[PDB]
């Protein structure tokens, strides 16, 4: 087998296809399934499979309590098939409450943060050994990218922030060979806060789109050089931004550059990929609650400052449905490489108050250049029937 | 790996032998098992996997009495091994309120098809991931066969029909190279309504029998050229016919041509298979209602018109129990192509009103050359130890 | 991959070593798990399976009351690693109430058989599909080994009965190669009622240690010719004989030639093999009950008429506990053929009667050629702690 | 495949990174999950693999009192992938009340003592099949590691002990090719008392940390010598003991020579290993009980006797956790020889009355040459939550 390096050029999408659901919270009332939340998607070249952090236990289980506690000892990365719901035999493939995942084209790299707020631990896991790790940077919650990590001739990077949630922090983009940090550069250009990227390769490099939770409703980009480790980074153009929460359409704005402050502090993890000059981005339905799910191109909204005309809309979890975050994956196909992206459903806490617990299910989608229809695919539990 | 031509001969067969039953509903009153309806079977080179359409719930579970809804966005293709009831760690293929699969010799295709009914969207997954994808061209349940569909060097075929249920609608028959639509041909030829084709390899082309909802209870025929990808049809030539509602044996009639105007409205997803001149064919033995199944030959069944001389009849399901829908697979044995067939076996709703849920388990038999004797292998279920 | 042939000279033991258990009526009241008996173990070139005859039901659920009825259309042959109990998502690898399978170094072969009591099927499935089937001949049970088939340079054979239990029956001997039966023996010989036969490789042959349900308490031999498809039968020799029910050994027979008619009807399934003159075997500790198990060796035991010297002899199963079925499997060592022999440990009805169902769990013993000590691993359940 | 040398050097750590948990009793309060106990991690050169003695049973059933008895005859070897919990698909290798696993480069070797106290037998399983077996020695609870054993070019090695768990016993050094027991070695040197050794190549040889039951809270070293089978012994020279009960670290004592005699009766099975003149080393927070778990580097703990100078703490399990056995395994790296360990971490009794039963979970973290933070990684379940 040989290294991925992903150098085909993007699929040309009418807009996205159902892929993949997979009743987490349905089933769980009636079996014995995992408490999660963070899920992503990541395939290896012949299959996809999900991810999620566990809470270190089932949900119809007194332990299912414990998600009102954040980053506990007992958050392990579970790894499925994709399709294949989180049952007892799901394995847990490292301690985690904050991770990341990537396939080389030869073995699976996992990024796993667990331990202390101030004094975490990120263990680096490659073909199924422990190859490296590194300490907390800033005492602040070392924490990363909650989906896939981009490899590209043997070259798997990742982002990675610690510090505040809600000012300036410490971001730095490590670079990692075969488990083993190779280099780490520090965050440059002019995003001003960096949390969770969504990222995806762009031959030769790796762009991400991110979550700034301090001042900007808009999405910050952070471009990767995987030649000489430099970065570059600033915001989505579109001035129908990403980030919940956020203002409304007729008042949000992006100059590219600087975060909007609008709404700005606080967010939700998400995605968008640029094609040429226009944009595919998802985001909630809801302009401040994690209600809903939709997606649509902005004409424009790669390229254009606060370009606002949107075309191909669809919904993939109407407004009368929980969403939560949301982020990418990339597929490589016979003659160029296809975009997908995942929505978490989260269910209970803290919108859902009559069950103790929080956990999620998930919807996926992937890019097509076909046709399609509508529809809207929510989580579908009936909170009445769900243990407490 | 190559792909798969089906270029042997049929095997001559004496009748069929029991091959495979799943228990689920039996199991389901004692363990975590997936509500389904619609199964299938379908075999890569090596083995034999069964598939059912879930309903995004186990059944001993509150959300069983969710299938009192059709087409619901939470409905997922199943698919396990051929034998292993679908338990909580089966894999979820797709979002599919109705689907087709097929191994091509080289990797698995999946047609699945959800959302709204009047825009619904079909996905055409194939060696794992999304290919392409259709949406609705009538605007009212684009919709496809329920069983698998059937490959001839890397060009698999099936057959999808979006329209009334009960008047004329719009067949299309597609063409489809590694997940990829290279063909749409119209229906052709003198069947009148088209649903769920049990569709084989019949070398050099592909042959289906199907289900007329409109006007028939004779089974309409479709033939497909894979060189050209022309398109005929007509009807099953049997006077025995194989539809549900039909009339009785005495009173029942095809000519080949047209639909029977007999009991013609409603139907039931079936099979049938030529032989020279002869006919292999499965159909419930209530008249009425889908109870029961049985076998056998029926002679100048395929060539000649209202033929009713029939021969080595099985009892596959007694009359004392419910069947439902049943289709055909084929299996390549080492010097003739098999043919096997699987019957759905429905408990619950309509039939059954102790339960709010409906669901099934199948039965499997594959041809035989060899001898064989007699049974009853029904579903099994004891109604009343069922939760509701 | 390569035919077996078995060439190998027999290992030459000291007695036997603890190999597996399953613990599955222990496990039954904390988890679901099917209702079986019948079981036996079989290995391919690399790893050893466990089957048994599940009653289409799992323990703790009220269609476990079923195993009333005998040879029920639900009964199906399961088959797992060794070591893994049979749970859900185990799979049912055919329909049968009475089977055998083997591996023929390339590819398994099962011998299946269900329906009608007057009107049975044998199917043969090879390679993952149905290769041939047979009906009954005598119109009485159709039925088979309960334990490994044996395959010597492609040529599987296979040891099947039909007819009465309690009389003169029809025992045949089939050759199949890749699922195909090539050839039909008869039964010849002096052995007059064959069920059962605990068959194993003894190169260029096969041969049988079986139960005769008639006239017997000595356990007839059938050996098997596999270059001509010729048949001998007999008895074995040692006067310590291995059926249930049987006399006190102070007082039990053999000739090596007639059934000993000491409590000659009724019967268990049980093994034995030969080693020059001496013989190794297995059976129940009490004489008229299913209770305990005990191997040994005999002096001259398959060579001398009414030998009764023992020696190195094993408790597998005290007296105290319920034993069952046994049977015997080969297993190729770097040098030499090995023989290992597995123990249905049987619970439930119609000893047990506090609840309604019948079920067992296993243990298995390989031969050795190094030393051992004592001991007793019976099922272990507490017949108080079982659902009902 | 080739066998293994384990001839690259030993990587050099800076202290030890989180590679795994597997929530075991937090999961058995909702769902089925094996009890269990002496768990341990072995590796074949792809992947990691955990394993524990079952106490044939899950939690939530009860059977799970059955713990209060010694080594019954239901114990069972359990193996899964590392993270993957002992759930009800889990296959049980082999019967054992005390075990030892390791894999030479082509196939697993299992080594699993069951049956009576003064009676025992060993059997050794390799690639799949039985190929050896020996009796008790001593007649007195024929033991060995609880953890992985050994194998260079093909040889393996193992420890095991017979006789009084209070006073001198008969330990003996097991070397075997494929499973077949090539030699046995005495124990020679200065250890007094060897139970239960935690063993890691260190080419060309194998060295163990084990456990003095008699008179050591120091703990006894084995030094193997795979080239002529030789066997050494002595004591780890640190004055900071690794034993469970020990003195205190400003009252405790080591001369490298002898047992010290503090506290020396009872103990517990723990691991160390040599890096030049220095160790690194695992404990028990607590001198008394089996609560909280910490490593730390000891500064001439290898070669300076009663040397208390240590460096690089880390918290594993605080000491307001319960802990229990622990062990080490390694893992083959590019180019060094990692060390890692795990910690059982037992709940229920005898420290936790409210329930009968006794299980564990398992912790476990792996060397690195990079930096990491703090953090507590304890068992999490809630002793209320649980079945009794
Ligand atoms: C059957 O399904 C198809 C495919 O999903 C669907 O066609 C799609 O309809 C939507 C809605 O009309 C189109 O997206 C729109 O494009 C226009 C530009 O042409 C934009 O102005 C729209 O955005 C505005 O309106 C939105 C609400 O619709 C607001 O949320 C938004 O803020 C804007 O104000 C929107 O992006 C889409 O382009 C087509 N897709 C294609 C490929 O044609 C069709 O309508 C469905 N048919 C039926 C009868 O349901
Ligand atoms: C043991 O099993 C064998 C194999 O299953 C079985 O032999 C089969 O019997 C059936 C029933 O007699 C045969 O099928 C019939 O064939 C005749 C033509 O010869 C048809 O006329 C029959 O159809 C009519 O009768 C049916 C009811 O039997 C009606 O349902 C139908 O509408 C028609 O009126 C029917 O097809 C079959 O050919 C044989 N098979 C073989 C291979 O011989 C045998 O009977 C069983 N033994 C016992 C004791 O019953
Ligand atoms: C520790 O374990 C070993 C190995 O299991 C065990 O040694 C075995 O003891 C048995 C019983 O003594 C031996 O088997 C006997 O062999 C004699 C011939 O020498 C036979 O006469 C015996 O049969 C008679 O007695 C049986 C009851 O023991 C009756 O059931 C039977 O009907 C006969 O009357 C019996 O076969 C066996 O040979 C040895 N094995 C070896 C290899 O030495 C040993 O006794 C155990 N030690 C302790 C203290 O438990
Ligand atoms: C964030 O995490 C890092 C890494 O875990 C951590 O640094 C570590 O701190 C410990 C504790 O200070 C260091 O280990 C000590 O080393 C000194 C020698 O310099 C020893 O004297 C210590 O042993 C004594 O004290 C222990 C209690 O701390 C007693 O239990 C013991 O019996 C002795 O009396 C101890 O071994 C360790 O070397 C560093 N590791 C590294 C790599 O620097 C750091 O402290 C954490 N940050 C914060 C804010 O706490
Ligand atoms: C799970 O945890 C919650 C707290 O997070 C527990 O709920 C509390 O219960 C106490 C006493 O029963 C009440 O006084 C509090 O008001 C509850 N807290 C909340 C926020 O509801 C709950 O009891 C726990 N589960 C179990 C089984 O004990
Ligand atoms: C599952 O759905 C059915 C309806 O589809 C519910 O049954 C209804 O229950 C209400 C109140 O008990 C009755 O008034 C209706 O007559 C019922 N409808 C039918 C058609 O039976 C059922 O309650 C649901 N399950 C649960 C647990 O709520
Ligand atoms: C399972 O089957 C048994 C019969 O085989 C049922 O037990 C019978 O129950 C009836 C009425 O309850 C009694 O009159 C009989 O005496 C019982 N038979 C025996 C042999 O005990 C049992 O009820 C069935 N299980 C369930 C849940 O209905
Ligand atoms: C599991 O075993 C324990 C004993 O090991 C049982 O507990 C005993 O129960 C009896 C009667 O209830 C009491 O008299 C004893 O004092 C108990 N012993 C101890 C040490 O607690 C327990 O009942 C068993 N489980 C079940 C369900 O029977
Ligand atoms: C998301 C969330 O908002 O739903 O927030 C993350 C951070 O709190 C947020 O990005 C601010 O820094 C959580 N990550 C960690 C490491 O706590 C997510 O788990 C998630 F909670
Ligand atoms: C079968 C059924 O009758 O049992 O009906 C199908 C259609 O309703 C019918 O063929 C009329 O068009 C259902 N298909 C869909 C897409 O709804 C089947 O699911 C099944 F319900
Ligand atoms: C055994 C049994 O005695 O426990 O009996 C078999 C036969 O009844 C017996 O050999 C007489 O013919 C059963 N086999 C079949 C096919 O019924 C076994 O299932 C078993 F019941
Ligand atoms: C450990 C334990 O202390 O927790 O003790 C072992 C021995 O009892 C001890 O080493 C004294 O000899 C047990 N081993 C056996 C074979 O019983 C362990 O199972 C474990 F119990
Ligand atoms: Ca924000
Ligand atoms: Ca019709
Ligand atoms: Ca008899
Ligand atoms: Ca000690």
Redesign the pocket.
């Given at each position: 087998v040989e290294y991925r390096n992903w150098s085909k050029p993007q699929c040309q999408i009418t807009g996205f296809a159902p892929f993949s659901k997979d009743n987490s919270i349905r089933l769980s009332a009636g079996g014995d399934i995992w408490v999660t939340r963070e899920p992503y998607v990541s395939c290896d070249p012949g299959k996809c499979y999900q991810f999620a952090l566990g809470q270190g236990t089932t949900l119809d289980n007194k332990h299912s309590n414990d998600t009102v506690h954040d980053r506990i000892p007992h958050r392990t990365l579970l790894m499925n098939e994709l399709g294949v719901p989180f049952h007892l035999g799901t394995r847990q493939v490292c301690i985690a409450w904050s991770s990341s995942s990537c396939h080389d084209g030869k073995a699976w790299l996992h990024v796993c943060i667990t331990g202390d707020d101030?004094?975490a631990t990120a263990s680096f896991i490659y073909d199924g050994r422990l190859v490296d790790s590194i300490?907390?940077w800033s005492?602040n919650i070392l924490r990363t990218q909650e989906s896939e990590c981009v490899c590209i001739n043997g070259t798997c990077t990742v982002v990675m922030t610690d510090g505040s949630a809600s000012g300036r922090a410490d971001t730095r983009i490590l670079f990692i060979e075969e488990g083993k940090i190779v280099h780490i550069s520090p965050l440059s250009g002019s995003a001003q806060h960096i949390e969770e990227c969504s990222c995806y390769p762009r031959y030769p490099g790796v762009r991400c789109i991110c979550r700034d939770n301090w001042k900007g409703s808009n999405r910050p980009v952070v471009d990767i050089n995987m030649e000489d480790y430099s970065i570059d980074s600033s915001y989505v153009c579109s001035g129908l931004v990403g980030d919940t929460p956020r203002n409304d359409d007729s008042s949000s704005n992006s100059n590219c550059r600087n975060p909007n402050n609008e709404r700005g502090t606080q967010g939700v993890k998400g995605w968008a990929f640029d094609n040429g000059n226009d944009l595919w981005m998802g985001r909630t339905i809801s302009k401040e609650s994690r209600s809903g799910y939709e997606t649509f191109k902005v004409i424009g909204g790669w390229s254009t400052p606060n370009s606002k005309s949107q075309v191909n809309r669809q919904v993939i979890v109407d407004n009368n449905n929980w969403s939560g975050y949301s982020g990418i994956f990339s597929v490589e196909g016979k003659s160029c490489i296809n975009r997908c992206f995942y929505v978490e459903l989260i269910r209970g806490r803290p919108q859902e108050t009559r069950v103790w617990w929080t956990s999620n299910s998930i919807v996926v989608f992937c890019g097509t250049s076909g046709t399609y229809g509508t529809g809207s695919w929510p989580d579908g539990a009936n909170i009445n029937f769900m243990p407490i």
């Open positions: 101030k004094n300490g907390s005492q």
